[PDB]
Amino acid sequence: EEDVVKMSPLPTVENQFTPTTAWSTSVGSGIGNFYSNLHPALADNVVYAADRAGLVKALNADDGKEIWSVSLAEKDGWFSKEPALLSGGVTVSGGHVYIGSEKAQVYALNTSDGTVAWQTKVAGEALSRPVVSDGLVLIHTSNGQLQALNEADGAVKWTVNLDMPSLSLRGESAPTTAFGAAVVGGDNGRVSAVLMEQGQMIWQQRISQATGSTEIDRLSDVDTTPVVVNGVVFALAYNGNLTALDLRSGQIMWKRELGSVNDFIVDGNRIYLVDQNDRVMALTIDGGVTLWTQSDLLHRLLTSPVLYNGNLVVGDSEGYLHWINVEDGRFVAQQKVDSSGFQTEPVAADGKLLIQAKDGTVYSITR
Amino acid sequence: VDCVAAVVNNGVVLESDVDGLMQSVKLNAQQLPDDATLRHQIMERLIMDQIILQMGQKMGVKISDEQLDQAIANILNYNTYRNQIRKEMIISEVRNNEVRRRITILPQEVESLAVGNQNASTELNLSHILIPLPENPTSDQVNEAESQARAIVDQAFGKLAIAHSADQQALNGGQMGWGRIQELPGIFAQALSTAKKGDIVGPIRSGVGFHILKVNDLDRAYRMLMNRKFSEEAASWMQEQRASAYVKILSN
Amino acid sequence: KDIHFEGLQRVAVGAALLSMPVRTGDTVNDEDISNTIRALFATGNFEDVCVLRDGDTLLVQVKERPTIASITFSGNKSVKDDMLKQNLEASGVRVGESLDRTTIADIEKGLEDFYYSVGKYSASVKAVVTPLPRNRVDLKLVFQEGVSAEIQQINIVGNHAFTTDELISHFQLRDEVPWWNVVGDRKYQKQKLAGDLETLRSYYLDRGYARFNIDSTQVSLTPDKKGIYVTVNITEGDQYKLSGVEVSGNLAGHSAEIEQLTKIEPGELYNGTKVTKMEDDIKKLLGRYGYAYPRVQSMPEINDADKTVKLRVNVDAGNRFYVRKIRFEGNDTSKDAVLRREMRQMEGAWLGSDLVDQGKERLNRLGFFETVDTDTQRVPGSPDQVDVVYKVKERNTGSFNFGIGYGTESGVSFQAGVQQDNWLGTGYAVGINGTKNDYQTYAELSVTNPYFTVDGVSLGGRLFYNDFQADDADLSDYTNKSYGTDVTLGFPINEYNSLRAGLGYVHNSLSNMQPQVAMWRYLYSMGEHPSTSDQDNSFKTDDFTFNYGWTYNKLDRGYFPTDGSRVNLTGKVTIPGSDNEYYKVTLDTATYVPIDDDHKWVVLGRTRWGYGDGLGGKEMPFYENFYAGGSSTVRGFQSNTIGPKAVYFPHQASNYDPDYDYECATQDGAKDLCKSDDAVGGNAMAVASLEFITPTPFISDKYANSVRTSFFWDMGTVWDTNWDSSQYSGYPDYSDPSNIRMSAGIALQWMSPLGPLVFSYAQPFKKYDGDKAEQFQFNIGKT
Amino acid sequence: EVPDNPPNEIYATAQQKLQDGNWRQAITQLEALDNRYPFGPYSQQVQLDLIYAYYKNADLPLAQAAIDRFIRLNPTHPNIDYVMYMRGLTNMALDDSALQGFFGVDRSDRDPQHARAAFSDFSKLVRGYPNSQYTTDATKRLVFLKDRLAKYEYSVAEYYTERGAWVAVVNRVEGMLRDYPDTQATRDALPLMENAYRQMQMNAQAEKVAKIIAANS
Amino acid sequence: KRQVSGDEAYLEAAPLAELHAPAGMILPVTSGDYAIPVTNGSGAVGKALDIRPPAQ
Amino acid sequence: WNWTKRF
Amino acid sequence: YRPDINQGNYLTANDVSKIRVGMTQQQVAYALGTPLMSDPFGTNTWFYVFRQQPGHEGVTQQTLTLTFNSSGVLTNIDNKPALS
Ligand SMILES: [Mg+2]
């Protein structure tokens, strides 16, 4: 069995610089082939990486030395082992490390030592990023419930049920917060904004042109984190439309025939995204006019793009990091980073580009 | 004496119509380049018109005659002229019908009430050259497209607006008439910020292609923004229909 | 003036004439010819046309659309070619008409559609249009089917009581399939998911969770459409009790017996299996009373306060239906009697749903049919008469088996054969089989009629030829070439039981016999007095044996049993008029007692008894002696090493070589009897084995049940009651059963892709002289 | 493999193969001609040749499909009697589908639904076309099919006598006397019904069956 | 598998003779859905009939 | 290993 | 050994008591159901046979003969509770 197309040949380009790994720190079995949103974070100078087995390491961002390490797995005797199944990406905002798990448990650990500050059972697999906002931790469970939990107490403040299709795509849209309004992408194509206090429905708008095929192929999931810029919410469904909508009313500002489940950057007057066909597209914000398109990485299983030193960075399921130019989209640089591959999104914070591979070995890149 | 240039969908573009419209633009023209490039551009334009015609002559109804007569009287073989005007006013109507559904206009900040917006100072007479690109112009399309665009901007305009353009105004020369600041695509706004009498604007990266502008002359905002969104969306959707069609070139 | 076409090779000329307004004797100008060509392409008759300039009148060139003459499919590994040819047919383009290039992409997406439906969410297709003269083209679609969408993980949410691995172990959908284990496939199906949801519900209702509910079932695709994640978001309740059971509805006067079925002890955990068994018991009771469709709805009234369950068993005994006639459809090979003798529901009797289900299950157990469906059609013009029509899909019943295995007991076992289990559709099973061990070469030809009597008595004959090399079996060297026939009647006296009784003639040819005390004692007692020299001896016997047997099989599971007992008492006594005059009784037993409700911990009591002696004036043949040791009898010992040891006489071997000693050869320097360590077996054996089966310690619980770990302790002693302890006093008394060898060890069993692998490491802590203590025993796929 | 030759030569070659006795080439040529030129000249003769070749090549299911296509496409045809007779022949060939060889098994107690279909087809043919050239051949085949169906019901009755299902035996022989009153199998099954009545101690009907046997022995 | 059915060599079936109802009783009604019509013709049987499809 | 093939 | 051999109608032993002379065929056919065996030779002589042969227990048969007339009205009830 061979894929639909031979995975796009490695685009040979002359790198304008020498991309190197500043430091490498392995994490045991690193989530693995399993699809997850689990990616490192960075609060001030500490990289908080996690693992599917339940191993969470806080490392020094400058040199990759273990500040501390904790195991969240709950073994029972010597008959069965229970890995924590961490899937929610690490989010560290208020001095706590928030990690979701597929056991419907969200853990807040202390950045000081790694002890479990609290742990709360939620509706389903916390596949989304446990975003932190307004003293609340918002997660989007795989069951379809958007749950907001107390930042310190840990008890669920509220839970809002979202419609779930018969079939969906792995992963849930991490909430985005703006002006006390939380915007999430339901798996049925409905982008939904609710309040940040008890979560009553502000509005819900369908953004997916899908369901026309009437099959199990045109899944209309919105698995990307919406981005709020200038009071406009940009969302990107799967097999749907890249839609800019009014935050207050929910009416569509504009729409493009683009579908993806990868997070996109919205900065200045530009939106950079990776298509469902792993096609790197940059569009305008005013009307969504596609400024440029890169199909040389077609069907290469790219990760969510990030902006590092004014240069887009994209992974792939081969351990290759492609530095794509911001302006014309031409491949500025290309680095062979790992052999297992890249699935989770990188993070570009504090001048550091951090990325986990499919074996979890955390790498810091310098441009 | 009447061959076929190409087949598109179930329709076919002939050689009689290609040569007839070439003679029409010849009589209209302005100076024009070598007739071979005009041949290729004319078959390209007729393929462009026929593919969108298939979208509308099987679904959309047909224009009336007396409103057509009023339009032509307001502004050779009479039968052929009436055939061409019936050929074009229906395609403009169906293009508008599709583009209106591909565009949304809110009474909110989409209306851009906050009417002055960016300064809208004076109407501008500007010309447009477009370099068509495939929905996936990566591999080498953009690379050669860049080379052609640099050659065009270095050379400049009467030749090139017909040579390798893609909009319906390719044969006319990209003329847009009077145009205000907000009645232009968003990519063109920054070029307009650097625009000047007789200035040549370099190619602008876009999914539609590379756009070259040259300024020739130096509820109200609803029509301005509608014009700019219509330009962007029509330019996009023409490329989408070009990619989503079966076109073959017949050397014969 | 006059149109002259040049094409129209395939399309009729009249179609072009009617599709082209300008014709012979018509006005000619550019506008008209343009209109005619536009209307000609309007119908799509011709792919390309042209008008060629000619001084004489008008000329027309025509190129019709290239007709497809054949459809070629390549690379469609996951689906049959004509399945996609039906897709091409349904689109509207097929062989016999033209090919449309526009329709090609629709074809491509159509093939994507059924690859999506079958489970290949990524399967690209490329069209290849090979030209052919006379305006023809052959499509050669290159299929490139991506990686199949396998289940990456099955997750359960809210299963605080039971681990996810334990619940998924019973699922037929598998997220982990180890290379060394056969636990299924990772392919995902809707029906499989529904069946596993029902399995999860059954598992939770069997543990007392009456309030268990599956809140939702999320099926998600990895964005690459290669991995499938199943999240069964459940809400388990508490471990409820069973306070009482009540029955209602029209019990039709059998209220007393139905209540007699519904005894429960209070304070016992709710069990969905027990509830369903009670419902089926009431159904069977009413069906035995003549009710065809005894509807039974056992609704639970759940007291959350006291956390108890009260079962309201509403019973509605429907009208009595009678089977006018039982009809069999699709039995083109098997005759009607073969299918009808497996029916428990009888034509002309009152219809019984349980009886019909039993008949369908028996037909499925025959193995002659791919699938067996039952339809209880209503007889027209009769309110309570039905026809129980059975639709069977006949199988290619004949098959040839090709097994290869390895083990310490028998070395390399090459098994082969061919058997037609439905010979001429008469129900007879004919079959030739063959086995080649390191020491035994068996060739069998068995023909059996499963129903020699309508009651179910089978009659089977068997022509067998066994070449047994005793030296290779870790015994005293002798080659026994036996051949004969058996005719055995099997009596199914009761279910879980089967007697058998038959007559068998066997001719044994013994050669290369090692001179030894036991074999020579037998030969002397058989009336022959040949010399102790001449290693290559020869003996021939023709012996007729009445064989009897009784097999009690209550094992709930055929593979890896957890509860029940399997006893096999097989005796063989020589009828008068045979060269040998002896009887030999053997008794196997394997009882499985589950000591836990989950049946993970099992106690296995395995016994292996045997006693045989002559009937006066004769002794038991030395080749019929029992053996112990090796795998499956006494682990930790060498194959057939437990028992009396051969006492070789001073004799001259056929071949001699220094430093080999040739088992006490005269050339080596032997003049007196010697104690040899090569075992010969004994006329009696007694073996017992206590085997504590535990869940595999270090393994994922998803396939823990697929690997049986056991701690075994085997006692076993083989003795020869005819041993002459008087004139053989220096040697150990081989007629002493008190020398009970014992071994203790650990064992692993699992169905690897190489067959059933059984490994074991055992230390014999109480072994005697001459017992080869083979610590490690194993057997790779004996099947 | 058949080249795309004009229909006349391909049809002539297929016919020559048909009298030559070599079938598979004839089927291939006929199906190639039919597929290349659907509903062309003398297409009905091509369909008849295809049906005959499929029947003679032991390819019964495709013969049935082709016959159904012909009968639904030509409800009023000059050679409709021929195609119904071919359908009956195909059904009868499905009846005697021995897995290995046609031996003393006689296939009487095998699946009779193909025999029932063949009997219905030939009955329709003879009732609708009593003057066709296949009329008396179809009548003889109906006689044989009636004998075979009654033999199947007799085998069922014999098995039920062995089992002791005397009610089933009585019902089966009553079904014989109704549907198949003039068959040797019915004459053989009458003693079975008498035995079933006697074993049930209903001598009031056993005597009637004995009288019937005596009057017809 | 069905080649021998090309020549089934039938016609050995005994002629169908209706049973006679003895005095005092009548045989059950035939309901002749399996009845043989009296239709007859030349129709040379025993492979003498040409099953070759008649071209028109 | 054990192989069996349905012919 | 041999399985359960059930044959004929299941006489409840209480439905048969409800049968009295003068009832039409419809009423009895409602009370006990259509008999498995009729009299195909003679008149409407319905035979309701409740026959049971268990697994080596001994065959027990209850015969119930209902002799009607041409008119369709019951005339005679020949009940044999056991196999003679
Ligand atoms: Mg999702």
Residue numbers in the entry:
A (entry chain B): 26 to 392
B (entry chain F): 25 to 53, 58 to 103, 123 to 161, 164 to 168, 170 to 206, 212 to 273, 395 to 428
C (entry chain A): 27 to 809
D (entry chain D): 26 to 242
E (entry chain C): 32 to 87
F (entry chain I): 1 to 7
G (entry chain E): 28 to 111
Task: Give the original sentences from the paper that presented this experimental model.
The outer membrane is a formidable barrier that protects Gram-negative bacteria against environmental threats. BamA is composed of a 16-stranded β-barrel, which, in E. coli, is preceded N-terminally by five polypeptide transport associated (POTRA) domains that extend into the periplasm. Unfolded OMPs are delivered to BAM by the periplasmic chaperone SurA, but how SurA and BAM work together to ensure successful OMP delivery and folding remains unclear. The results suggest that SurA binds BAM at its soluble POTRA-1 domain, which may trigger conformational changes in both BAM and SurA that enable transfer of the unfolded OMP to the BAM lateral gate for insertion into the outer membrane.
Identical Compact and Extended conformations of SurA bound to BAM were observed in the presence of the inhibitor, as were the differences in interaction between POTRA-2 and BamD in the SurA Extended and Compact states. This increased rigidity is observed in our structure, and allowed the resolution of the complex to extend beyond 3Å, enabling better visualisation of SurA in its BAM-bound state. Interestingly, the addition of DAR-B to this sample (2-fold molar excess) yielded ~ 25% of particles in a Lateral Open conformation, whereas no Lateral Open particles were observed in the presence of the same concentration of DAR-B when SurA is absent. Structures with DAR-B, which functionally mimics an incoming β-signal, show a complex between SurA and Lateral closed BAM is formally possible. In turn, this suggests that binding of SurA to BamA POTRA-1 can precede substrate recognition by BamA-β1.
